[PDB]
Design a protein around this ligand. Structure first.
Ligand code: LW8
Length: 275
């Protein structure tokens, strides 16, 4: 008699769309609620604010992003993913009363990336190596990465790097680095574009980037209304490897397949969804 509909959003990209449709498929099979997925609905701070204000109900957030962008002041965390999740989970509950569920296994980190030929021609192995050639190479970064302390501001503070940066739209940066307009971009480690374009990830030798694992973020009030959401979505906890997410991103972003159908097929193959 109550078929409440949940709004599930995801940041720009095939990956959050896949994850949101996974949440929707799981919720509709195992609960009495429905869900609407809002693709590419906004960047981190928009979804975070929409969640607190109640314009959306759930979105997938990443552990290092909670501690680095969402928590103010940002706590000094280790590199161990489980401890970082605990700080994020406990921290985001105290600050904003948000229930951060348990993470999936794969990490999706910011990844400073250059074409393989650029790495070989310039002797680039680590992020530190970029200081050698910061006057010769052009970088194209998302605005959010430019805005973040664990992004370009961290490249400046932690490495002393002063890159020549053009601010880029997220969906256009890979084509620019492939075409030669830029030689450095802020890749995401599960992005299918890394292998497609023969990009090489530079090693985070100073460990600017914390761990990033994804998990559902929602108001505590929604969990109180619907406690079954915790068990239902936590079937993803500790699941989905890096290579599994990458192939799903490839299926949606590159092969043009429906995010819902890709999500559904993977869930069924893995035994989390009927049929
Ligand atoms: C996965 N990630 C690399 C840690 C980022 C990706 C991202 C940040 N902003 C947008 S849009 N996407 C994030 O979710 O914070």
């Amino acid at each position: 008699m109550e078929k409440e509909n949940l709004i599930i959003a995801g940041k720009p990209g095939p990956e959050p769309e896949i994850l949101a449709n996974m949440y929707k498929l799981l919720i509709e099979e195992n609960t009495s609620m429905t869900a609407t997925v809002k693709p590419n609905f906004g960047t981190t701070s928009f979804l975070y604010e929409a969640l607190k204000k109640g314009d959306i109900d759930i979105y997938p957030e990443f552990t290092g992003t909670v501690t680095e962008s969402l928590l103010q002041p940002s706590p000094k965390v280790s590199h161990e993913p489980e401890q970082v999740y605990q700080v994020a989970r406990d921290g985001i509950a105290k600050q904003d009363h948000l229930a951060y569920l348990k993470p999936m296994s794969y990490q999706n980190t910011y990844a400073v990336a250059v074409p393989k030929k650029i790495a070989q021609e310039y002797g680039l192995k680590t992020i530190s190596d970029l200081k050698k050639v910061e006057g010769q190479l052009k970088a194209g970064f998302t605005l959010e990465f430019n805005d973040r302390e664990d992004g370009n501001k961290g490249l400046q503070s932690m490495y002393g790097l002063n890159l020549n940066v053009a601010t880029m739209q997220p969906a256009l940066r890979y084509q620019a680095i492939h075409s030669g307009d830029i030689q450095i971009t802020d890749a995401y480690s599960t992005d299918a574009e890394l292998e497609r374009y023969d990009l090489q990830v530079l090693e985070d030798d100073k460990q600017l980037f914390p761990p990033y694992q994804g998990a559902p973020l929602m108001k505590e009030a929604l969990l109180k209304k619907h406690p079954e959401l915790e068990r239902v979505l936590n079937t993803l906890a500790g699941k989905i490897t890096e290579s599994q997410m990458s192939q799903l991103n490839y299926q949606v972003g590159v092969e043009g397949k429906s995010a819902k159908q890709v999500a559904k097929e993977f869930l069924q193959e893995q035994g989390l969804l009927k049929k």
